[PDB]
Amino acid sequence: GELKTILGQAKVSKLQEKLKLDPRSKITFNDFKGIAKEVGIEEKEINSVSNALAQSGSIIYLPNSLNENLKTSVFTKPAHIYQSLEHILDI
Amino acid sequence: GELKTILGQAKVSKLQEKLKLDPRSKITFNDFKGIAKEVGIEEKEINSVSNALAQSGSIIYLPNSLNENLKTSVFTKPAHIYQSLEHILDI
């Protein structure tokens, strides 16, 4: 199923590109779902895609957080957050 | 916790930026593992990180492919592959 795998991945790549163009750096998870649907990602796959993007460091999305804000927020440009955190904690 | 999750993700973000700057567009999984180790990702974590990067569309990695070339190859700049494939097949 190499062809099917690649073509589905291509949609998430488009999602990554669109989050890059978007000037927002923090959006709601509902906002994120809408952008994912714009590039053709099916509803039943959005949760899985959000998890893959978080584990790959492409977004920060912390649905298990008890902080009400982080729980429903998607950070779409997390490189700045990673770099800032390692700077201020000197690690 | 949120902080450990973010700092773990930061390593995979660093891996993505190393792969972007590497002149090669196709590397062995062995070489991929080595670059990941350079940024602190252990061999114990590599399979999960590669799954997340593949599902995110950040790499193409088809280890179960029967084509002997693809099964050990990591495509580190797949954006051009996605574009070409959708173009030549007209969706």
UniProtKB/Swiss-Prot annotation, chains A, B:
Membrane topology, Mitochondrial matrix segments: 1-91
Family: Belongs to the MCU (TC 1.A.77) family.
Localization: Mitochondrion inner membrane
Function as written in the Swiss-Prot or TrEMBL entry: Mitochondrial inner membrane calcium uniporter that mediates calcium uptake into mitochondria. Constitutes a pore-forming and calcium-conducting subunit. Mitochondrial calcium homeostasis plays key roles in cellular physiology and regulates cell bioenergetics, cytoplasmic calcium signals and activation of cell death pathways. Sufficient to operate as a pore-forming channel without the need of calcium-sensor or auxiliary subunit.
Subunit structure: Homooligomer.
Organism of origin: Dictyostelium discoideum (Social amoeba)
Effect of residue 45 to A: Impaired homooligomerization
Full protein name: Calcium uniporter protein, mitochondrial
